Ligand binder design. Structure first.
Ligand SMILES: Nc1ncnc2c1ncn2[C@@H]1O[C@H](COP(=O)(O)OP(=O)(O)OP(=O)(O)O)[C@@H](O)[C@H]1O
Ligand SMILES: Nc1ncnc2c1ncn2[C@@H]1O[C@H](COP(=O)(O)OP(=O)(O)OP(=O)(O)O)[C@@H](O)[C@H]1O
Ligand SMILES: [Zn+2]
Ligand SMILES: [Zn+2]
Lengths: 96, 362, 184, 145, 48
């Protein structure tokens, strides 16, 4: 059971993005697209660093996007996290 | 003269390289035959004279001939290895060195760790004039010169890689030269690159399979002084048969887990030994005669050895061997002691080993 | 950040490509320090946000115990964690990691012998074999090899490898002796 | 043929009980676990014989004095004075014993080979009794899975 | 086998709706779409 749980963790992380949850095939329609997306666009470390930056930055100094994310984070509202959508799906036709 | 002698040398090299595997298998068959003959080997009597008993009377010359043949085949197997498998190792090593010089600059921008035997030894081969001897890319020196020459110094890269400005430019220009003679044995020896051969010998000596074949040869030689050394060659069945490798992979897949499980068993048994040595020493008499009391737990080391040797092997735990706790003021404590020993050591830890092997299979 | 935003929002623009080559060095320098995420903005669209990642934050993130914490959190959220609570668990993990990374930054205040012995053994034991070439043995053997002998050729060809094996044995013995002398 | 021979000797009719494997298919399902990895099982048995032979060689070269199996001092019954006898002893009395060959051979207490023989017995128990039998167990369980 | 059966039950319920049988991806094209569909639109408790 422990071995199967580790294998399941590996498979889930290798086949779908942690944040948006989209499958690897859609991203891999472009070469190296999945790891590009999971390391640059939707990196969980990047979200953690953004939370640290947003907390350490002064409240008056936030930009519009920073203030929006800040107020939703303070009111415990998690719809700013992309779910089932990304930049490549918003601009699929424009990008290519 | 060279045209025939070198051709004959190449013929022998090619023959050994082709027949390397057949000689490897024949070496196992001969070892199996020698051990089967040795299964008829008795002690005859002070001085102990090992004597081969035989009704036929023919098996002892057979044993001597088989030992000589096994030694010769073992030498031929290392020759075949040097002819066939060594070039692949040299090719891989040279490829790695060239690519770390080019795409990493491991001897220009950075330096080996000084605890990496591979890097420290490969430092030598760069200056040799016979580098990529096996690797196809003959232009690694020029590529590294182009990549790092302007920044770290063209001349500096030149002495690092053994390149010669003074000779290359004037050889491209008009330089009068004199070629050597192949019939000249002095010229033939002058042609060889001693430093590259030193590096190659070091790599071969550091090779694992070459060391295994050398151990095989050494055991075969020692078998003549003592015939029972030929039993060590039965350990070669793991490499000889691949289904044996599949079976042994179950053990070796979780070898670290197995070793740590054994260590944990020794720690738990030591804790039980501490408890017994502090409370239950009176129950470790192992002598039937009342005149001679043989205490197996009067000492820490003796008690620990007793628990590890007689206790773990026993199917019922240490209680199968220690005295009866009936009618004693520590009776319930000792019953708990024995039951917990049986449950944890005999049942659980052995189950951990079982599960590790089964999990490796799965 | 301006140039990266422009480049990503105008993927096909040669004129912008030119400024990208002109600013490659600056972008190369600031690449580790540049953060990039995607959020669902107020316009009900996916918007990409660029911020600054600090060197201290990145080092504390790359420290091994933080990686172990990340691995444990991923294991938990994948095995027993739910989809509906995934982003709450992730935010809690991020907050704990941020606090411990800040605390670590606060508290932070401003074999080789065996390898050398093996190298020496290799050099010595190979030079011993190499000295056999300048003994003038080949010069003396020239007159004796003027006459061809197949058996002599095969014997010499075997003897070379026998000498190689003997040198390997000497190397192993020297390595053992040196290792024991070291551990003593 | 077995049915005909049963008339000459009635106990030949017991050989027909071997037909239950084909008669019942759930018996075939059970026996498939054994027969699925039959080659692996046979090679595991062969490896056991090789390891036991190596242990027999070690015992025959160093630990012959401990293989007395006769209680009377007048008659010494050496079970390892000969290669074949020692190998048969290790394969028969040793593998079957739950504690290895040390359950049957003499006590190594107070001897100049004591620690070597303790290592001998412990390694025999660990490799032969524990590991190889575990390999057989795992082969059957893996066939089931 | 018992463990595998429980895992199969969990996987089937998490990846497809009990009633319609459509996969979770189609519903998850909209955020939280799968659990919205399986708890409001096609809830088996609602059918009961
Ligand atoms: N949102 C995501 N962010 C990062 N990685 C993701 C994401 N979604 C899926 N992955 C997968 O996780 C992999 C990275 O795994 P992880 O974050 O555990 O570290 P790693 O690269 O394996 O190494 P390390 O543990 O040493 O940091 C990526 O290669 C990718 O396949
Ligand atoms: N038609 C469906 N109706 C309800 N749940 C469904 C349906 N199809 C799939 N599911 C899945 O079943 C999950 C609910 O599981 P279930 O009905 O066993 O109860 P639960 O939420 O796990 O808890 P509890 O057992 O305490 O009521 C949903 O979250 C969803 O993933
Ligand atoms: Zn994503
Ligand atoms: Zn439905």
């Amino acid at each position: 059971e422990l071995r199967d749980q580790q294998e399941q963790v590996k498979e889930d992380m290798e086949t779908k993005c942690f944040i948006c949850g989209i499958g690897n095939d859609y991203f891999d329609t472009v070469p190296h697209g999945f790891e590009t997306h999971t390391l640059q666009e939707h990196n969980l470390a990047n979200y953690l660093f953004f939370l640290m930056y947003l907390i350490n930055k002064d409240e008056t100094e936030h930009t519009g996007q920073e203030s929006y994310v800040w107020k939703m984070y303070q009111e415990r509202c998690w719809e700013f996290f992309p779910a089932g959508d990304c930049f490549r799906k918003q601009y699929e036709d424009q990008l290519n | 003269f060279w045209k025939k002698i070198i051709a004959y040398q190449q013929k022998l090299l090619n023959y050994f390289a082709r027949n390397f595997y057949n000689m490897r298998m024949l070496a196992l068959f001969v070892a199996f035959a020698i051990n089967f003959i040795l299964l008829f080997y008795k002690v005859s009597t002070i001085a102990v004279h090992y004597v081969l008993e035989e009704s036929s009377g023919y098996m002892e010359p057979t044993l001597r001939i088989l030992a000589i043949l096994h030694t010769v085949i073992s030498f031929f197997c290392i020759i075949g290895y040097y002819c066939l498998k060594v070039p692949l190792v040299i090719f891989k090593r040279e490829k790695e060195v060239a690519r770390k010089l080019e795409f990493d600059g491991l001897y220009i921008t950075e330096q080996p760790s000084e605890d990496d035997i591979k890097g420290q030894w490969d430092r030598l081969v760069i200056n040799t004039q016979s580098f990529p001897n096996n690797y196809w890319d003959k232009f690694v020196k020029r590529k590294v010169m182009d990549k790092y020459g302007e920044f770290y110094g063209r001349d500096r890269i030149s002495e690092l890689l053994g390149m010669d400005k003074a000779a290359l430019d004037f050889s491209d220009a008009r330089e009068k030269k004199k070629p050597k003679k192949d019939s000249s044995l002095s010229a033939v020896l002058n042609s060889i690159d001693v430093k590259y051969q030193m590096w190659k010998l070091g790599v071969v000596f550091t090779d694992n399979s070459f060391l295994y074949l050398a151990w095989y040869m050494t055991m075969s030689v020692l078998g003549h002084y003592n015939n029972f050394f030929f039993a060590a060659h039965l350990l070669d069945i793991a490499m000889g048969f691949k289904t044996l490798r599949t079976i042994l992979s179950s053990v070796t897949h979780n070898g670290k887990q197995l070793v740590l499980t054994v260590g944990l068993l020794a720690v738990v048994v030591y804790l039980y030994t501490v408890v017994a040595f502090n409370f239950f020493r009176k129950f470790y008499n192992k002598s039937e005669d009342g005149d001679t009391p043989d205490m197996k737990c009067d000492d820490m080391l003796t008690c620990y050895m007793f628990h590890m040797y007689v206790g773990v092997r026993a199917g019922g735990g240490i209680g199968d061997e220690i005295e009866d706790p009936a009618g004693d003021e520590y009776e319930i404590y000792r019953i708990i002691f024995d039951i917990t020993f049986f449950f944890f050591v005999i049942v659980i830890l052995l189950a951990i080993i079982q599960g590790l092997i089964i999990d490796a299979f799965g | 950040v301006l140039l990266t935003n422009l480049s990503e929002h105008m993927p096909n623009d040669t004129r912008l490509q030119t400024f990208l080559e002109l600013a490659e060095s600056v972008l190369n320098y600031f690449q580790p320090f540049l953060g990039r995420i995607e959020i669902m903005g107020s316009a009900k669209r996916i918007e990409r946000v660029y911020f600054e990642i600090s060197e201290s934050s990145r080092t504390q993130w790359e420290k091994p115990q933080v990686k172990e914490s990340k691995r444990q959190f991923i294991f938990d959220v994948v095995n027993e964690g739910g989809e509906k609570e995934k982003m709450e668990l992730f935010v809690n993990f991020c907050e704990d990691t941020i606090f411990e990374m800040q605390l670590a930054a606060q508290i932070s205040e401003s074999s080789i012998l065996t390898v050398r012995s093996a190298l020496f053994a290799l050099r010595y034991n190979i030079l011993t074999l190499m000295r056999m070439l300048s003994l003038k043995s080949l010069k003396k053997q020239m007159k004796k090899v003027k006459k061809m002998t197949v058996k002599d050729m095969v014997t010499a060809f075997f003897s070379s490898y026998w000498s190689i094996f003997m040198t390997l044995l000497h190397f192993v013995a020297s390595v053992f002796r040196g290792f024991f002398r070291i551990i003593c």
